[PDB]
Design a protein around this ligand. Structure first.
Ligand code: ADP
Ligand code: MG
Lengths: 371, 66, 56, 188, 56
C-alpha cells in the first residue's frame, strides 16, 4: 500500500500520500473553543473547530496553537488535530497506512516517545517512522551534501550534512522563527496607532506580514530612505475596511532574523549562525558547504532574503570561497516533498518501526536502531 | 541522484509555461469580450425599460391628475 | 372610506418608492457595466501582454 | 412629543384618553424624512405636505411639518431632551464593540423589528445614515420584512415549536425546589 | 365597493413589483461587489507583479 507522509510542523500541517509533488491538504494547526455564550438553539454548534474551519469562524473563537516551539505542549489538542487530518482531510483510515512524521532536531525525548505511543495506540497505524526535518529538505533539493537552514514557523535549525554523513556536533538550533516575527510586527504596528490584541487578530497581523514585509538588502540605507521619501508606504485593507499604511515597518519586522537583539534575544542572526555551524565542521568540507547552502522552510520566503544572506556570508567568509545560496521556488513544501521522496524509496522500506517491534520494546524503541 | 532534477524540472519548464499561456488566452477570450457584449446588451434592455417606465408614469400621471 | 384612503395613500407611496427603485436599478446596472468594461479593457491589456509572452 | 408639538397649531390634547387619538394620528400620518433639512425647507415654502385628518367628532385638523418632525426624534434624541445618540448611531456603536472579524456580517445583516420601525421611509434613512458612518467598502443592507410588527411573536412561535427546545422549559417541580430564583439559573 | 376592489388589486400588484425589484437589486449588487473585489485583487496582484519586476 501507500504511505502517509504527514508533517506536523508548527503553524501549517502538511499531509499527503507518498509519491506526489505537493501535499494534498494544507491547513493551519489551530484548535479554537468558542468563548461567548450562544443563544440560538439547534444551530448545531460544536465544542471545538479545528483546522481550516476555525480560520473562518475566528471572530468568536479563541484559537490556540498546540505546538509552541517544535515541542508539543497540549497533547489532547494535537491528538484532535491528527484525527482531523486523517479522517476529514484525507479520508483514509490509519489502520492500513504507514506514517512518516517529522521532528525538529534537538527536541525533548518525551515528545517523540509520546508521539509514537499515540500513533501506535490511538490511531493504530501499521508502522511509523520519525525523521529530522532538515534531511528531508536536503532530499528535495536532489543534493547529497550541503548545509540546510530550515527556518520554519516554530524553530529555526541549521543542520550541516556532507556526503550523506550528518555532523551531529554542528547542529545550531535557534528558537527565533515566524511566530516571533508575527509578535514583533504586532508590537511595532502600535507605533502608528493600530492595536491588535485578540488571538484572532494575530492572524490578521500574520497576513500583513506575509503580503507586505520584505528583507532589506542594506538596513541603514533603507532606514534612511523610508525616513525621507514615501515610496515605500504600502496600504492594506483590513477584514472590515479602514485601510492601514505600513511605512518602515515593512523591512523592520523580518530584519529581526539577522539581528535577534530586536526582540531581546542574545544570539546572533541567521546570517552568523550558519557561518558558525560551518566553522565547527572539519577543514576539508568547508568549501562544499559554502557552495551548497540550502534554504528551506516557510519563513525563508521573504522577498530579497537570498541576496541579503549571501551578502552577509560573503562578508564573513574568506574571500576565495564561492558562496551560493540554493533557494528553490517550492521552498514552503520542500520538507514534505523530501518526505515523499524518502517514503517512496525501496531501500528505505525496511526501516519502518513495525508494530510487533514496538510491542516488544515499548515506546522507547524510537531512540534505538530504528531512529 | 541529481539526475531526476532534469526529469522534474525541464518538464514543467516548458509544459507549464505553455499550458498557463493557453489557459490565460482561453480565459481572456471567454471572459472579456463576452462580458462587454453582455453588459452592452443589458444596457440596451435597461434603456428600453427606462422608456417603458417613462411612458407608463406619464400616462398614469396624466389620467390621475385631479 | 378609511380603507380606500389608506389603500390609495400607501399605493402612491409604493409608486414613488418603486420609481426611485428603478432609478437606483438603472444607475447600479450602468455602473456595473462601466466597471466590467474597464475590467475587460484591462483583460485585453493582459491579453496583448500574453501575446507578447507568446515569445514563450 | 407629537402631542406636545401639535400645540403649535392650536390643537390641545391633554386627557389620557386623547393620547390614543394622538397615537392614531402618529400611526396614520407621520413618516420619516430621507433628509431632514430639505424637508424642513420644503414644508416651509410649498403646501404639498399638509395632510388632514378627522377627529372622532369632526373638526378636521391639518398637520404640516409635524409629520416628519415627530419620528425624527428617533435619529436626534436631543429633541425630547435625551442626551444619547439616535438609533442610527447606537447601531454603529453596537457593531464597533464587536470583534473585528464579524463586523462585515453584521453590516450585511442588519435586521429591523418592533412596531415603531414601521414608519414609511425608515429603512432608507437608516441605511443612508449607517452608510455615511461605516467604511466605504462594506455593504450595508437593512432587512425590513413586511411582517415587522409581529416578528417577535412569529419567532416565539417558531422557537416554541422546536423539538430541540422541548427540554428547556422550567418545569414546576424545579421551581418548587429552588424558588423563583430558578430563572437566572441554567434554565435562563 | 368597486373603487375598493380596483384600488386593492392595484396596490397588491405594485407591492409584488416592489418585492421583486428589491430581490433583483440584491442579486445585481452581489455580482457587482464580487466584480469590484475581483478588480481590486487584479490590480493588487498587478502591483505585486510590478514590484517583482522591480526586484528582478
Ligand atoms: N509567502 C510568505 N512570505 C512570508 N512569510 C511566510 C510566507 N508563507 C509563510 N510564511 C511564514 O511561515 C510560516 C509557515 O511556515 P511553515 O514552513 O509552514 O512552518 P512549519 O515548518 O511548521 O510547516 C507562517 O507562519 C508565516 O509566518
Ligand atoms: Mg518545517
Amino acid at each position: 500500500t501507500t504511505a502517509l507522509v504527514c508533517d506536523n510542523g508548527s503553524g501549517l500541517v502538511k499531509a499527503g500520500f507518498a509519491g506526489d509533488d505537493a501535499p494534498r491538504a494544507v491547513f493551519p494547526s489551530i484548535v479554537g473553543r468558542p468563548r461567548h455564550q450562544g443563544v440560538m438553539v439547534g444551530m448545531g454548534q460544536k465544542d471545538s473547530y479545528v483546522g481550516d474551519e476555525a480560520q473562518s469562524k475566528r471572530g468568536i473563537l479563541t484559537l490556540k496553537y498546540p505546538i509552541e516551539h517544535g515541542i508539543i505542549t497540549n497533547w489532547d489538542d494535537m491528538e484532535k488535530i491528527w484525527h482531523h487530518t486523517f479522517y476529514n482531510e484525507l479520508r483514509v483510515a490509519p489502520e492500513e497506512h504507514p506514517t512518516l512524521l517529522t521532528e525538529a532536531p534537538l527536541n525533548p525525548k518525551a515528545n517523540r516517545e509520546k508521539m509514537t505511543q499515540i500513533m501506535f495506540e490511538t490511531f493504530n497505524v501499521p508502522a511509523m517512522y520519525v525523521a529530522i526535518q532538515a534531511v528531508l529538505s536536503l532530499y528535495a533539493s536532489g543534493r547529497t551534501t550541503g548545509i540546510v537552514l530550515d527556518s520554519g514557523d516554530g524553530v529555526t535549525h541549521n543542520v550541516p550534512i556532507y556526503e550523506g554523513y550528518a555532523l551531529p556536533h554542528a547542529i545550531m538550533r535557534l528558537d527565533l522563527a515566524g511566530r516571533d516575527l508575527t509578535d514583533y510586527l504586532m508590537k511595532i504596528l502600535t507605533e502608528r496607532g493600530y492595536s491588535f490584541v485578540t488571538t484572532a487578530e494575530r492572524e490578521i497581523v500574520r497576513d500583513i506580514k506575509e503580503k507586505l514585509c520584505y528583507v532589506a538588502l542594506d538596513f541603514e540605507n533603507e532606514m534612511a530612505t523610508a525616513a525621507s521619501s514615501s515610496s515605500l508606504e504600502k496600504s492594506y485593507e483590513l477584514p472590515d475596511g479602514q485601510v492601514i499604511t505600513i511605512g518602515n515597518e515593512r523591512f523592520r519586522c523580518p530584519e529581526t532574523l539577522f539581528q535577534p537583539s530586536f526582540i531581546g534575544m542574545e544570539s546572533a542572526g541567521i546570517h552568523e549562525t550558519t557561518y558558525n555551524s560551518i566553522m565547527k565542521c572539519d577543514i576539508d568540507i568547508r568549501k562544499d558547504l559554502y557552495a551548497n547552502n540550502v534554504l528551506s522552510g516557510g519563513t525563508t520566503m521573504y522577498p530579497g532574503i537570498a541576496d541579503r544572506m549571501q551578502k552577509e556570508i560573503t562578508a564573513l567568509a574568506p574571500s576565495t570561497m564561492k558562496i551560493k545560496i540554493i533557494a528553490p521556488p517550492e521552498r514552503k513544501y520542500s520538507v514534505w516533498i523530501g518526505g515523499s521522496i524518502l517514503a517512496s524509496l525501496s531501500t528505505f522500506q525496511q526501516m519502518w518501526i513495525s508494530k510487533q517491534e514496538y510491542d516488544e520494546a515499548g515506546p522507547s524503541i524510537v531512540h534505538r536502531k530504528c531512529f | 541522484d541529481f539526475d531526476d532534477i532534469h526529469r522534474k524540472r525541464m518538464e514543467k519548464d516548458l509544459n507549464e509555461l505553455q499550458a498557463l499561456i493557453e489557459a490565460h488566452f482561453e480565459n481572456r477570450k471567454k471572459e472579456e469580450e463576452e462580458l462587454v457584449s453582455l453588459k452592452d446588451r443589458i444596457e440596451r434592455r435597461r434603456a428600453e425599460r427606462a422608456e417603458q417606465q417613462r411612458i407608463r408614469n406619464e400616462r398614469e400621471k396624466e389620467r390621475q391628475n385631479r | 372610506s378609511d380603507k380606500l384612503k389608506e389603500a390609495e395613500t400607501r399605493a402612491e407611496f409604493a409608486e414613488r418608492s418603486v420609481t426611485k427603485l428603478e432609478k437606483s436599478i438603472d444607475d447600479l446596472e450602468d455602473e456595473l457595466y462601466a466597471q466590467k468594461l474597464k475590467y475587460k479593457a484591462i483583460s485585453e491589456e493582459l491579453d496583448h501582454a500574453l501575446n507578447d509572452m507568446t515569445s514563450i
